[PDB]
Design a protein around this ligand. Structure first.
Ligand SMILES: [Mg+2]
Ligand SMILES: [Zn+2]
Lengths: 108, 152, 162, 266, 166
């Protein structure tokens, strides 16, 4: 196929300036109760997700430093404890993951 | 046409799809949290449901042992799956895992989501907390329920 | 210490008089302020040194101002004097002044225009010691004078963003 | 006549506003901190007799202005349009909080005042009864039989007043001026006297809704646009008028709306 | 080369009188050299045109697009400059009035097509202009109901007169 004539700026606009191709205004943005960085409905907050990701990164780093090399993963649960906080008498067999700093305002 | 067709497509075929599913399941059993696209996320969740069911069926069973060995190439994760994730959920029935959507990525802008077994030790994700019971509509509904109870 | 500096200035000037110095200082101040009102950098540089030029012209850039002068309270007295080779002279002032700085699109953000205010000033002067004159240098904000006027608009100081 | 009483009340309110504004020493800068759970924590250098928490919300973000309703000043809730006296703290509150009791009471009082204004403009009031939120039916006694058409007309008038979008002009008037304003009504005079005797000093809080003035106890709703839904259940007996309304972000779809209407009809 | 958007911010207006309006504060800002296409830039601008700064930032924080972050950073820089330089106290009392885009200095490369023939690979480049105006955003033009159409038709039928004679 080959164009027999040249398209016009008017036809180009009518093709690209239609509501179908134009970005639709979404109304799923809401304010998060914590922090405050306008999250989205049915989606987790960005700041909280990044904080949880960093916490998991540090926990995995400490676990690797404790376990040592690969091919480990014992058959016992884990308990993340920060500075201080005497270990509870319930989790006796669960190996402790001594963490630094204090507990945040969302870990329970 | 694909009416009532389950199991979506992933890699270069069913073999690659099941291989990716097994790899994701192993990575989850190792770390207990993985970021994957929504499709693969729900697929891995559905597979981990049956995996936990098999692990709960029994350890001495040869079928469950073979299934665990085929679905966990790390080997070291089978003892954990059998002696940590099985007794911990001995009170529940089939409700496990947790589905939460991730906003977007940074390159391809994919619709990723989170997966993790209930409980565990990792930090808790910001679950979608519903409206408090002390709001206006909640208080109105509570008053309506109280009136209905007083009626009968 | 002040007498030695005065003698050195009178020797290197050499013609100089302090009895008629406050009047010339006030005249130079008024001329510099009128030039600022008119925005004449050429005439301003000839009255203010290079150290104080950006301190009063950069912040007031892109915004007019209507400075006024009327009736000087008390005579301008000199505090101290000290002394390449630049002679420093600190002059004390206390006159009624106005401040009506207008932004780009008009509006208002400082004091009124027809309301004089009493503001203390400790202007420091300097001079080149072959072709120089007594030009301002710096402003000593002592003594413990009132802070400033209340800005019409409101400002929001943000805290530590994590 | 009702055409001159409202005019005189508006004139007195304007005179009181002018008197309250003609005492500040030409802009008195102050500082207010924002100690809240979100964005910890900026400090605003607003005024004390002109600025309002609405200015702080605007400085922060439009979301705050769209969601903020009250502001706890040292534990006491304040309206969005009110001068922040002295240097204190601010805590923006919304409808989805842990303990939105103050916001609920403010919304109740605002709905009561709006219903009273609608009743006065339709065709003598007495006061605004402080009905808890568990009752689910704000009342407003009136001292004068309506039918379904009357209720429909009242709801239409309320919807029109809401669409008009009028802010709530609050003030901190004394008792003498408060009594001089509502001198043609003995019930309001007695209510103002009781309110003044309850507190240590006089300080009789008054509010205005464009052209109607009433008397309340706690804060109120800033703009009437927040009251999305609004209806009038029935009228009970001094005639008591019921009703139920729901603001934005709390839509009852339709079934829950009808259920709440039936519950309040009792 | 022609840089005028950055120079429009240096237009000093005369002072106003007490009996005159407040007059808004027209702020200008733009970024040069942006590895992006002009069509998508104009699309994003139109999406942000009929909106406020807060709503624009909210929509950009979730709009999956390479230029979304660039536009967000440009808007943030403009707001900062307005709060620090142009004397703008209210951050939410701002709305985007005009926002357009234009191509940039496009280079030229080779794509190497099949056979003994090649093609041209024009390095696409563009910019992005923004014009922030103080005050709340204006309401959109409401849809003319039947009353407006009837009034317009009545006016049209009334304007007519005898033609082709005296
Ligand atoms: Mg594929
Ligand atoms: Zn959050």
């Amino acid at each position: 196929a080959a164009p027999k004539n040249r398209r016009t700026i008017e036809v180009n606009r009518c093709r690209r300036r239609n509501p179908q191709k134009l970005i639709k205004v979404k109304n799923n943005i809401d304010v998060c109760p914590e922090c405050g960085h306008l999250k989205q409905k049915h989606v987790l907050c960005a700041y909280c997700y990044e904080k949880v990701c960093k916490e998991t990164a540090e926990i995995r780093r400490q676990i690797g430093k404790q376990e040592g090399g690969p091919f480990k993963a014992p058959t016992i649960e884990t308990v993340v404890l920060y500075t201080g906080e005497t270990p509870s008498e319930q989790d006796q067999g669960k190996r402790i993951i001594e963490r630094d700093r204090k507990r945040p305002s969302w870990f329970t | 046409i694909s009416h009532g067709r389950v199991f979506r497509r992933m890699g270069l075929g069913p073999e690659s799809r099941i291989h990716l599913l097994r790899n994701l399941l192993t990575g989850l059993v190792r770390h207990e949290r993985i970021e994957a696209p929504w499709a693969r996320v729900d697929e891995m969740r559905g597979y981990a449901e049956k995996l936990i069911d098999y692990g709960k069926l029994g350890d001495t069973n040869e079928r469950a042992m073979r299934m665990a060995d085929f679905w966990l190439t790390e080997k070291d994760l089978i003892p954990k799956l059998f002696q940590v994730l099985a007794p911990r959920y001995k009170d529940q029935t089939g409700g496990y895992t947790r589905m939460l959507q991730i906003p977007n990525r940074s390159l391809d802008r994919a619709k990723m989501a989170v997966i993790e077994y209930k409980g565990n030790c990792l930090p808790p994700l910001p679950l979608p907390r519903r409206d408090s019971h002390l709001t206006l509509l909640n208080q109105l509904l509570q008053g309506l329920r109280q009136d209905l109870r007083q009626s009968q | 210490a002040s007498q030695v500096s005065i003698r050195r200035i009178k020797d290197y000037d050499a013609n100089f008089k302090i009895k008629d110095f406050p009047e010339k200082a006030k005249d130079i101040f008024i001329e510099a302020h009128l030039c600022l009102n008119n925005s004449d950098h050429d005439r301003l540089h000839t009255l203010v040194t290079e150290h104080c030029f950006p301190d009063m012209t950069w912040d007031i850039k892109y915004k007019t101002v209507r400075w006024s002068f009327v009736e000087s309270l008390e005579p301008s007295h000199v505090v101290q004097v000290r002394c390449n080779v630049y002679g420093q002279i600190t002059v004390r002032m206390h006159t009624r002044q106005t401040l009506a700085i207008y932004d780009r699109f008009g509006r208002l953000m400082y004091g009124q225009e027809d309301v004089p205010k009493d503001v203390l000033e400790y202007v420091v002067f300097e001079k080149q010691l072959p072709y120089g004159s007594w030009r301002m240098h710096t402003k000593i904000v002592p003594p413990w004078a009132p802070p400033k006027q209340p800005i019409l608009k409101t400002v929001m100081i943000p805290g530590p963003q994590l | 006549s009702p055409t001159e009483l409202t005019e005189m009340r508006n004139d007195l309110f304007n005179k009181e506003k002018a008197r309250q504004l003609s005492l500040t020493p030409r802009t008195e800068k102050i500082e207010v901190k924002h100690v809240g759970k979100t964005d910890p924590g900026t400090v605003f250098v607003m005024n004390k007799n002109i600025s309002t928490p609405y200015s702080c919300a605007m400085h922060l973000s439009e979301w705050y202005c769209r969601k903020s309703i009250l502001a706890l000043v040292d534990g006491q809730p304040w309206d969005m349009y009110k001068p922040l006296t002295k240097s204190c703290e601010i805590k923006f509150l919304t409808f989805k909080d842990c303990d939105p009791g103050e916001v609920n009471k403010a919304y109740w009082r605002s709905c009561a005042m709006m219903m009273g204004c609608v009743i006065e403009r339709a065709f003598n009031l007495v006061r605004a009864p402080e009905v808890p939120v568990i009752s689910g039916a704000f009342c407003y006694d009136v001292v004068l039989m309506p039918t379904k058409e009357n209720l429909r007309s009242f709801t239409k008038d309320a919807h029109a007043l809401i669409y008009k979008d009028l802010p709530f002009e609050t003030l901190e008037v004394e008792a003498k001026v408060a009594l001089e304003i509502f001198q043609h009504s003995k019930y309001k005079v007695d209510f103002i006297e009781e309110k003044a005797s309850q507190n240590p000093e006089r300080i009789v809080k008054l509010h205005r809704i464009g052209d109607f003035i009433d008397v309340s106890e706690g804060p109120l709703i800033p703009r009437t646009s927040i009251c999305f839904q609004y209806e009038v259940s029935a009228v009970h007996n001094i005639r008591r008028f019921q009703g139920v309304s729901l603001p934005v972000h709390l839509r009852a779809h339709f079934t829950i709306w009808d259920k709440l209407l039936e519950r309040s009809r009792k | 080369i022609s840089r005028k958007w950055e120079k429009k911010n240096k237009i000093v207006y005369p002072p106003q009188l007490p009996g005159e309006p407040r007059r808004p504060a027209e702020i200008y800002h733009c970024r040069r050299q942006i590895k992006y296409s002009k069509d998508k830039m104009w699309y994003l601008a139109k999406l942000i045109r009929g909106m406020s700064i807060d709503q624009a930032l909210a929509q950009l924080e979730f709009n999956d697009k390479k230029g979304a972050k660039i536009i967000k950073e440009v808007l943030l820089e403009a707001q900062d400059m307005a709060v620090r330089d142009h004397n703008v106290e209210f951050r939410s009392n701002l709305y985007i009035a005009e926002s357009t885009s234009g191509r940039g200095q496009c280079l030229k490369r080779i794509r190497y097509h099949g056979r003994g023939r090649f093609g041209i690979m024009e390095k696409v480049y563009c910019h992005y202009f923004v014009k922030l105006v103080e005050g709340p955003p204006p309401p959109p033009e409401p849809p003319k109901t039947a009353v407006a159409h009837a009034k317009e038709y009545i006016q049209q039928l009334r304007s007519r007169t005898i033609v082709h004679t005296l």
